[PDB]
Amino acid sequence: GYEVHHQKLVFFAEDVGSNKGAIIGLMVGGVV
Amino acid sequence: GYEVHHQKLVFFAEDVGSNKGAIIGLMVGGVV
Amino acid sequence: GYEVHHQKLVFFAEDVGSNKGAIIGLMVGGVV
Amino acid sequence: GYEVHHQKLVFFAEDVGSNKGAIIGLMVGGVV
Amino acid sequence: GYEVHHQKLVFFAEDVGSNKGAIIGLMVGGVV
Amino acid sequence: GYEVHHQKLVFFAEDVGSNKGAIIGLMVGGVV
Amino acid sequence: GYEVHHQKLVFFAEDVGSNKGAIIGLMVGGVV
Amino acid sequence: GYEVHHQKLVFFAEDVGSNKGAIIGLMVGGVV
Amino acid sequence: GYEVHHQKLVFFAEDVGSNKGAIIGLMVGGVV
Amino acid sequence: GYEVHHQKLVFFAEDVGSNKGAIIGLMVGGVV
Amino acid sequence: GYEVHHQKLVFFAEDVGSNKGAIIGLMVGGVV
Amino acid sequence: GYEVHHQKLVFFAEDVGSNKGAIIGLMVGGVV
Amino acid sequence: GYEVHHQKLVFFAEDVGSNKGAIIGLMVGGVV
Amino acid sequence: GYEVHHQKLVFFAEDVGSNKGAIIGLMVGGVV
Amino acid sequence: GYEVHHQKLVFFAEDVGSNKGAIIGLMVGGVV
Amino acid sequence: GYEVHHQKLVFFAEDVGSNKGAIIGLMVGGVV
Amino acid sequence: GYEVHHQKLVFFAEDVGSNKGAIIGLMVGGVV
Amino acid sequence: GYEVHHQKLVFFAEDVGSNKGAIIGLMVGGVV
């Protein structure tokens, strides 16, 4: 029938006073 | 009776005096 | 109030004040 | 009548950070 | 008939030249 | 009805030319 | 007329009365 | 006289003898 | 003497009424 | 100084209709 | 100095306007 | 003199000109 | 005596160390 | 004193070879 | 106050007639 | 002292036509 | 007040066509 | 007082201009 495809990726980063901050190792998704 | 698809990932990092914070090792499947 | 299969992840790192904060290891096998 | 196959994951690091160094290990087999 | 295929990708970084302090290794999507 | 299929990519970085600063190893999408 | 080392991948797909929720995740190390 | 050894995968999606449509996740240790 | 190795990939997809809606995620290797 | 080595890749899809979950994610090789 | 090394790539498929809807992410080879 | 090594690609598809149809992210090779 | 926190892995493989079962499979939670 | 945090890996392999079956598998995830 | 961090990889491998017969499959990290 | 981070990759190897030699598969930590 | 980060890649070896299976597959970098 | 960073790759081997030699699939650098 009818299908709509979209995605939202917001990458916002400052850059001083920078400690290690954070680490993300992740698997999320693959199909539908 | 409507078929739609979306994704939503918000990656925000501030270079505060915010230290490691956390380490995320995750495998979460969202496929079917 | 109709929705379809989509991803939803909020990854945010800011003004951490405590310590390491958290170490997380989690896995799923076989998405419904 | 229609099912929405997705998961809600909010991962954030701020003032609050649980304990000095908390570790979480979890394994699941068979999402239903 | 209505069919659309797009994606919202937004990346903002301030004060470059020095390490941000954040690392994301992640897999999201693939098929829809 | 109008049908279109293209990506929307927007980004801005201050003090560019050096290194990325943070590192995002991310896979977003693949098949419509 | 001499045997040699080679890979063998036979992926055949015919759905049948094989519905939506068929997922298999499996890892086998030759010797380990 | 060289040994000729390789792995072989036969994945057939058909009326196999598993479940009507199950979800499985697992691993096997080759040798110990 | 003589050494000849070749790959063998046979990927075949049909299209009856029940659609190709299954997930194969496997890792075969490691050793031997 | 004579050697023979080629790959055999056979990708086949007819009267396609792949939807809901057609995904093969495989790590094949590593050793021999 | 003569050598015989070529690849054999065979692709057979339908190419209508709607995408088939299937993805093969496979690492075949590595070692031999 | 000159070695004998070249690629050999043969592809046959119906209604070409449009989109790929499916996506094969396949790494074939590694070592002979 | 100076205390420096860094990674250090020396993998030396020789006809030694291997005994009563040269196959190792181990995992460590979060903090050593 | 000052702490020196750096990466360091020395992979050294001689080539004897008859051995029980030298296979090593190790996983870490979080902090040391 | 001041710290020094750098990579250092020494990959050394011999070539006698008998291969050592060693495989390293590891996940090293766990920030430190 | 001053913060310094330089690269150092030394690959020393003998690649004759004897046995496999060695297989290293490793994820070397993101931070420190 | 200042930092130093230069590249340094050195490869010393026998550049013949390839051992049966000398393979280094590693992820080094990410952060510091 | 000034930041210094540039490329430096040195490939040395005994044989000829130099083929691949061994198989290094290594990710180096990326981010300090």
Curated annotation (Swiss-Prot), chains A, B, C, D, E, F, G, H, I, J, K, L, M, N, O, P, Q, R:
<feature type="site" description="Cleavage; by theta-secretase">
    <location>
        <begin position="11"/>
        <end position="12"/>
    </location>
</feature>
<feature type="region of interest" description="Interaction with PSEN1">
    <location>
        <begin position="16"/>
        <end position="32"/>
    </location>
</feature>
<feature type="binding site">
    <location>
        <position position="5"/>
    </location>
    <ligand>
        <name>Zn(2+) 2</name>
    </ligand>
</feature>
<feature type="binding site">
    <location>
        <position position="6"/>
    </location>
    <ligand>
        <name>Zn(2+) 2</name>
    </ligand>
</feature>
<feature type="glycosylation site" description="O-linked (HexNAc...) tyrosine; partial">
    <location>
        <position position="2"/>
    </location>
</feature>
<feature type="site" description="Susceptible to oxidation">
    <location>
        <position position="27"/>
    </location>
</feature>
<protein>
    <recommendedName>
        <fullName>Amyloid-beta protein 40</fullName>
    </recommendedName>
</protein>
<feature type="binding site">
    <location>
        <position position="5"/>
    </location>
    <ligand>
        <name>Cu(2+) 2</name>
    </ligand>
</feature>
<feature type="site" description="Cleavage; by alpha-secretase">
    <location>
        <begin position="8"/>
        <end position="9"/>
    </location>
</feature>
<feature type="binding site">
    <location>
        <position position="2"/>
    </location>
    <ligand>
        <name>Zn(2+) 2</name>
    </ligand>
</feature>
<comment type="subunit">
    <text>Interacts with S100A9.</text>
</comment>
<feature type="binding site">
    <location>
        <position position="6"/>
    </location>
    <ligand>
        <name>Cu(2+) 2</name>
    </ligand>
</feature>
<feature type="binding site">
    <location>
        <position position="2"/>
    </location>
    <ligand>
        <name>Cu(2+) 2</name>
    </ligand>
</feature>
<feature type="site" description="Implicated in free radical propagation">
    <location>
        <position position="25"/>
    </location>
</feature>
